[PDB]
């Protein structure tokens, strides 16, 4: 409603780096909000794409940011008869970035990992990795919960049970308010998907540099399944955290599985122990229900609601049989044990192939009227296909079915304007929460500021 | 007054054989539609599916490791396909294409270094390096070329169960000059697989976020060039390209994914699903049954309909089956001529004093081009 599309602050990154692919806000110890931007295609030390993270301080002019330095050297260690080796080439560092209090969690989902013991090996595969950083203190850590030393033939014997070799941990990530780093790993358990949770303090304390295969004590992983509805579900493609069981002493995980049950798609609510509290099923095959999940209180009743993006949802038209426009499903949480049933509102795209629902950003109370608001991105929407971000204001009965504001892409076509979104935080400190939009195809980040 | 004047009305043909490009399966072929503001005028279209119409059967075969038995059953397909398709058409062209999946981690086995030239290294056998889609045989009427080309095909091996089959469908659809799709012919794309399929946004597990643009990327090497740099297509883009190229996709899928591909074919017009055996041994009768089943249904589709214009159809199927609201007629056979009473309504009087849209059956180049003039 009041996001200003004229005075735009553009942060830019290296060309081809996919700057803006993932972005969060970082509040310094002094409270000065910076923008964490992930660029999974930043060139490393040997001109190889290794990814990077840029800590962009808030300046109303934008421009280039200083990179946040991580170790990008492929490590190799002999621990016993096994050679442990990590591969940072095309690891995608910055494909998801989340910032806790003073920690920046930068995840490299496609970081590969192999274990050589003899003529046998552990099948170099994208186990993923998250790089933790305290930028004000300079302290660095790492968290790869899916690294193992089990060899390939052992997995072939077990019929590939508990196979975390293709996790891609940090594909999606979220830090709970208590400080637990929840990682989505949609390739975990042979592409069934898993969640990896460990406290950030326990990741920083358990991390020894040089040691490649260690175990966080407080680390908790999801469970494997033989139910064929979970096969290739990509559980953990998107993760969120909310309050969906009344007990405000526990944190509920909101996991999107966009190909769950033969590409139908699901979003499961769970507790800290990965027991499925509720499961929301996709409305349409191959619509990618669960591609993005947002947890906001859009109707001001204190109970967190669930917004699920289905960016490949096909609606009914005349000149097009089924028009892939995308859809966002709003699930208002009612006063009850679970009570989460049918979507209380359906936001659908209008541009064909616009991918409406790829990102859903809780904007907080954008216009400060008592109801939290929502930004949904169509990274290829708008009448030109360059990308839109649509601001949906909350009301007493959910959201507004019509966007109060559309933010058209200030970048050329292919920029994927809106692929990453981030709101609810006030960069310029004028009392109104702002929106940070990431166009990784333009390698830029647009900063929309909310007017009074 | 608002009228519907018929400009081109060639009578429907009786046989699709002989001199083609004169075979008219839709009548009329052009209509001038004058509509005063906020008015409605009705016109009629006849859609006959003629007999002995030429067929293009591009066999798009999953060549993952589970399909090494199927290559023994396809080895004489093409001669048997020519013998069985000889009663259904007088001009048959068959082609062959193969897919496995995007040759990139975590779909492709990336270690040991010997598992890149031989993904079957851990199976202790030898297959081809993983490919995403390779065009093998351009649609040709020399049906022994199909046998010659499938006898020299080998499978590859990937890691996960979903395949890159929709990537291959997109490439076999949009590379129409490379595949060999004739204009005046039925375009049967026989998509055989025994596994789930990858869809858009699945390529992000490999680092591939760039959406499928639907362009041709099969070069002179006959391989899909954008397999590792471009995402999988969605059902929307793949359906749009199948509709633009008039291609009747046939899911020849094993019983473990028959329900998945039926739920897909419900979302893709012009598609049928046949149950493939675990060794593709019933694929000839599957193709024949799916050609008879695709031609057992006339479904209309509207292309580039103006926003101010709406359409309503009254499908005049089998003699007394006037079915309102339907732009389809199931339960047909080759030779049945169905009718559709279409009614175009305006919503106001737009700025453009003359627009144009086309009404065609799904899977045919024949169309009714309605030139709509707003006076």
């Amino acid at each position, epitope marked *: 409603l009041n996001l200003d599309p004229v005075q735009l602050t553009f942060y830019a990154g290296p060309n081809g780096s996919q700057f803006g692919f993932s972005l969060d806000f970082h509040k310094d110890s002094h409270g000065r909000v910076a923008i964490v931007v992930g660029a999974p295609r930043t060139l490393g030390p040997s001109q190889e794409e290794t990814g990077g993270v840029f800590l962009c301080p808030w300046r109303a002019e934008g421009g280039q940011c200083p990179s946040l330095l991580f170790d990008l050297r492929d490590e190799t260690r002999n621990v016993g008869s096994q050679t442990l080796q990590t591969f940072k080439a095309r690891q995608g560092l910055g494909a998801s970035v989340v910032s806790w209090s003073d920690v920046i969690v930068a995840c490299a989902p496609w970081q590969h990992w192999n274990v050589l013991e003899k*003529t*046998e090996e552990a099948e170099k595969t994208p186990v993923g990795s998250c790089f933790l950083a305290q930028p004000e203190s300079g302290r660095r850590a790492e968290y790869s919960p899916c690294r193992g030393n089990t060899l390939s*033939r052992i997995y*072939v*014997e077990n*019929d590939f049970s508990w196979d975390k070799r293709y996790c891609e941990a940090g594909f999606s990530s979220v830090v709970t308010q208590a400080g637990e780093l929840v990682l989505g790993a949609p390739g975990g358990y042979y592409f069934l998907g898993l969640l990896a949770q460990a406290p950030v303090a326990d990741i920083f304390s358990s991390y020894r540099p040089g040691i490649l295969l260690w175990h966080v004590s407080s680390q908790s992983l999801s469970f494997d399944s033989s139910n064929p509805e979970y096969f290739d579900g990509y559980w953990g493609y998107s993760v969120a955290v909310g309050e969906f069981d009344g007990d405000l002493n526990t944190t509920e995980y909101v996991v999107g599985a966009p190909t769950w049950s033969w590409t139908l798609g699901a979003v499961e609510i769970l507790d800290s122990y990965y027991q499925r509290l509720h499961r929301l099923r996709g409305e349409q095959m191959a619509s990618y229900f669960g591609h993005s999940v947002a947890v906001t209180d859009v109707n001001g009743d204190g109970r967190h609601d669930l917004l699920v993006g289905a960016p490949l949802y096909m609606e009914s038209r005349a000149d097009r049989k089924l028009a892939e426009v995308g859809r966002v499903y709003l699930f208002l949480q009612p006063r009850g044990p679970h009570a989460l049933g049918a979507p209380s509102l359906l936001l659908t795209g209008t541009q064909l192939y616009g991918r409406f629902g790829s990102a859903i950003a809780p904007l907080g109370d954008l216009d400060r009227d008592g109801y939290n608001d929502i930004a949904v991105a169509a990274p290829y929407g708008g009448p030109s296909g360059r990308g839109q971000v649509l601001v949906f204001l909350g009301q007493s009965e959910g959201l507004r079915s019509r966007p109060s504001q559309v933010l058209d892409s200030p970048f050329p076509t292919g920029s994927a304007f809106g692929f990453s979104l981030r709101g609810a935080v006030d960069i310029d400190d004028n009392g109104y929460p702002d929106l940070i939009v990431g166009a990784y195809g333009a390698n830029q980040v647009a900063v929309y500021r909310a007017q009074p | 007054v608002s009228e519907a004047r018929v400009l081109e009305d060639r009578p429907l043909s009786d046989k699709g054989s002989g001199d083609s490009s004169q075979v008219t399966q839709v009548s009329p072929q052009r209509i001038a539609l004058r509509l005063r503001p906020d008015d409605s005028k009705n016109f009629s279209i006849q859609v006959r599916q003629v007999e002995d119409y030429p067929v293009d059967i591009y066999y798009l075969m999953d060549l993952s490791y*589970s399909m*090494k*038995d199927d*290559l*023994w*059953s396809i080895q004489n397909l093409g001669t048997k396909l020519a013998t069985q398709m000889r009663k259904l058409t007088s001009n048959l062209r068959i082609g062959f294409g193969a897919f496995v999946d995007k040759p990139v981690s975590p779909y492709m086995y990336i270690s040991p270094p*010997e598992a890149l030239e*031989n993904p*079957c*290294y*851990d*199976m*202790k*056998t*030898t297959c081809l390096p993983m490919f995403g889609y390779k065009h093998v045989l351009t649609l040709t009427d020399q049906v022994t070329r199909f046998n010659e080309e499938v006898k020299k095909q*080998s499978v590859s091996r990937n890691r996960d169960a979903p395949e890159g089959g929709f990537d291959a469908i997109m490439q076999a659809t949009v590379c129409d000059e490379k595949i060999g799709w004739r204009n005046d012919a039925s375009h049967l794309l026989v998509f055989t697989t025994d596994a789930k399929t990858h869809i858009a946004l699945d390529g992000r597990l490999a680092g591939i976020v760039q959406p499928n643009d639907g362009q041709c990327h099969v070069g002179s090497d006959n391989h899909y060039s954008a397999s590792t740099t471009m995402d999988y297509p969605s059902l929307g883009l793949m359906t749009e390209k199948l509709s633009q190229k008039n291609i009747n996709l046939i899911f020849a899928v094993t019983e473990n994914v028959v329900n998945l591909y039926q739920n897909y074919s419900e979302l893709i017009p012009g598609t049928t699903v046949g149950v493939l055996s*675990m*060794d593709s*041994s019933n694929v000839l009768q599957l193709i024949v049954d799916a050609y008879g089943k695709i031609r057992s249904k006339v479904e209309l589709e509207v292309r580039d309909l103006p926003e101010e214009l709406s359409l309503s159809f009254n499908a005049t199927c089998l003699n007394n089956e006037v079915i309102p609201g339907l732009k389809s007629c199931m339960g047909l056979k080759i030779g049945d001529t169905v009718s559709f009473s279409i009614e175009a309504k305006v919503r106001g009087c737009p700025q453009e004093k003359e627009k144009s849209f086309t009404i065609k059956p799904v899977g045919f180049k024949d169309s009714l081009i309605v030139q709509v003039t707003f006076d």
Partner: antibody, heavy 118, light 108 residues
Framework: EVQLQQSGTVLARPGASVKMSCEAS????????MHWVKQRPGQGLEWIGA????????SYIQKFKGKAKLTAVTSTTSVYMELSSLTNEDSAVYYC???????????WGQGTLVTVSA | EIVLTQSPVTLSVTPGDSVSLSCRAS??????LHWFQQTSHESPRLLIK???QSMSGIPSRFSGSGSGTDFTLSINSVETEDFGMYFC?????????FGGGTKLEIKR
């Protein structure tokens, strides 16, 4: 035409070692894995392992790890199997077998009989 | 490994009668089940590949059937050349295993 030609019958003694060959002709030698199968007289067939003549990489059946050892000599296109610490349970017919383009083991050696009587 | 259990262990059939040899896998090996014949005049001879595909040059009396975990080898009219040992073999997972074997006797 893939033909597998093994060595002849070889008498041995317990605790000793026996090396049997398999001359592979009719296909590109280093490309394909060579598989070895054991069949005790009157009993069933038991897979021993495979050898990749390209990089001389070998993978055995856990029952045969340490007992059987596979080596390849790509100059003469021969695969050698060496049984170590022979017992009377090693007196069997050992076949080298190969798969075809359809990945079924249609090509077998005539078999090398081993006798560990002492 | 995938255990292939053949039944019966031995089987007496009159020359000209019909036989049905069974194989049962520990797990799903879809059609990756092959049938070998060994009457000791040569190495094991592959009769039916992929559980239903007769090899070239194999008599038309040998028939394969089955999928998943239960497979069958049927002989229409056993000749004097068919009496021997029949092994089912899986090439689904490595290590590749054989069945216990099934002898065919003449049953006079």
């Amino acid at each position: 035409e893939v033909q597998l030609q093994q060595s002849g019958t070889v008498l041995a003694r317990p605790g000793a070692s026996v090396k049997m060959s398999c001359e592979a002709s009719g296909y590109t030698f280093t490309n394909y894995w060579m598989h070895w199968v054991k069949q005790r007289p009157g009993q069933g067939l038991e897979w021993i392992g495979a050898i990749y003549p390209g990089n001389s990489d070998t993978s055995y059946i856990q029952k045969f790890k340490g007992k059987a050892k596979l080596t390849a000599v790509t100059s003469t296109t021969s695969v050698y199997m060496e049984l170590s610490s022979l017992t009377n349970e090693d007196s069997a017919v050992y076949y080298c077998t190969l798969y075809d383009g359809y990945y079924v083991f249609a090509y077998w050696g005539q078999g090398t009989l081993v006798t560990v009587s002492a | 490994e995938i255990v292939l259990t053949q039944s019966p262990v031995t089987l007496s059939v009159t020359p000209g009668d019909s036989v049905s040899l069974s194989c049962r896998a520990s797990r799903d090996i879809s059609n990756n089940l092959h049938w070998f014949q060994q009457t000791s005049h040569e190495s094991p001879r592959l009769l039916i590949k992929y559980a239903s595909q007769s090899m070239s040059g194999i008599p038309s009396r040998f028939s394969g059937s089955g999928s998943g975990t239960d497979f069958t080898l049927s002989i229409n009219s056993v000749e004097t050349e068919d009496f021997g040992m029949y092994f089912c073999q899986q090439t689904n997972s490595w290590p590749y295993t054989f069945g216990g074997g099934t002898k065919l006797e003449i049953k006079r």
